[PDB]
């Protein structure tokens, strides 16, 4: 008599019906590039998990980045290296272009197209109303097509998007998180960063889905059109969703406690009190007002839903009225 459990309510069997060895990263056997190809030209950043670089084929002068693995698990590794070949070629998925070992680290080196990225903290500068539907459109084109294929990416937000905004070219990166999903699994709920958190991971609830990824994209929604980054932002995990009740309100959080029988810790409770759901109007001022519709305001409301099962899927965003006229102009006769 624990939890309520549930399935994915599209893409269910997607991997139930893949022979084994599309989802079996375990199995699968590494064919190594060639290191001496790329010649690292500058650090862009350090993380737990990795350091990346930008780098140079020398073979023909092209620009790449790498990302360099911090000693690891084989099984980890070949789980983001299995997801990142079976995405390959999809809209706008980073493309993995070589896989090497690095001969100072003796640690798997990842290759990636290079995109010449504005970061997202500066990106805002004259970023208007139709630039955020247009690469919120583009990041729903991933993923749906990645949870068509049976995965969930389970760490999207802003530093995970890409946008070379001269050119318009968008893509979601960073698979080191991302997972298969198979009805009826339960996986680990430390995933995702703090901000972006479904509620499902906030309260220990471990049979979630593809749906976690568009609770994430609507925290990025909510932040760019209000101007907020992040827009729920908690001190750790707990506070995480008080900050999400103060404005979602108490009632629908409980109510989706009583229907998944979830159970929350002890006085969990307490600094979770009591909450009066708040009109998306409240964030609306005069520096955001410009960013901000009805239609904006109705999408993003059917993705902040506490119940999971409720949320938007990637491909009914996508059908928005919100993006109706991005829909238009990506209709080109070519
Ligand atoms: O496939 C990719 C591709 C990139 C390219 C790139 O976005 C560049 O710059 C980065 C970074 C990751 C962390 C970081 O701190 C940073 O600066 C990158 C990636 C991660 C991936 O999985």
Redesign the pocket.
């Known amino acids: 008599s624990g939890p309520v459990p549930s399935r994915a309510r599209v893409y269910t069997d997607v991997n139930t019906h893949r022979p084994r060895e599309y989802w079996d990263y375990e199995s699968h056997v590494v064919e190594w590039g060639n290191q001496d190809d790329y010649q690292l030209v500058r650090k862009?950043?350090?993380?737990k998990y990795?350091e990346?670089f930008?780098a140079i084929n020398i073979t023909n002068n092209e620009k790449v980045?790498v990302?360099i693995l911090k000693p690891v698990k084989k099984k980890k590794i070949k789980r983001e290296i299995k997801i990142?070949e079976n995405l390959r070629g999809g809209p706008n998925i980073?493309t993995?272009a070589d896989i090497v070992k690095d001969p100072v680290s003796r640690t798997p080196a990842?290759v990636?197209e290079y995109?010449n990225?504005t970061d997202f903290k500066q990106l805002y500068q004259t970023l208007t109303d139709y630039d955020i539907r247009f690469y919120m459109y583009e990041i729903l084109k991933a993923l749906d097509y990645c949870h068509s294929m049976g995965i969930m990416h389970r760490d999207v937000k802003p530093?995970?998007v890409?946008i070379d905004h001269e050119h318009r070219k968008l893509?979601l990166?960073?698979?080191?998180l991302a997972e298969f999903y198979h009805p009826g699994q339960e996986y680990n709920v430390r995933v995702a960063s703090r901000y972006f958190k479904g509620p499902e991971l906030l309260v220990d609830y471990q049979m979630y889905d593809y749906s976690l990824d568009m609770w994430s994209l609507g925290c990025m929604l909510a932040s760019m059109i209000f101007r907020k980054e992040p827009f729920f932002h908690g001190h750790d995990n707990y506070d995480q969703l008080v900050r999400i009740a103060k404005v979602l309100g108490t009632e629908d959080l409980y109510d989706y406690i009583d229907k998944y029988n979830i159970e929350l810790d002890p006085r969990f409770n307490d600094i979770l009190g009591r909450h009066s759901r708040k009109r998306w109007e409240r964030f609306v001022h005069s520096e955001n007002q410009h960013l901000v519709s009805p239609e904006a305001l109705d999408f993003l409301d059917k993705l902040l839903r506490y119940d999971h099962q409720s949320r938007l899927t990637a491909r009914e965003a996508m059908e928005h009225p919100y993006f109706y006229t991005v829909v238009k102009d990506q209709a080109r006769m070519g």
């Not at 990166?173 to 080191?176: P, R």
């Open positions: 862009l950043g350090r993380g990795s990346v930008e980045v990302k990142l980073i993995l990842l990636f995109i990225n530093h995970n890409m893509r990166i960073d698979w080191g």
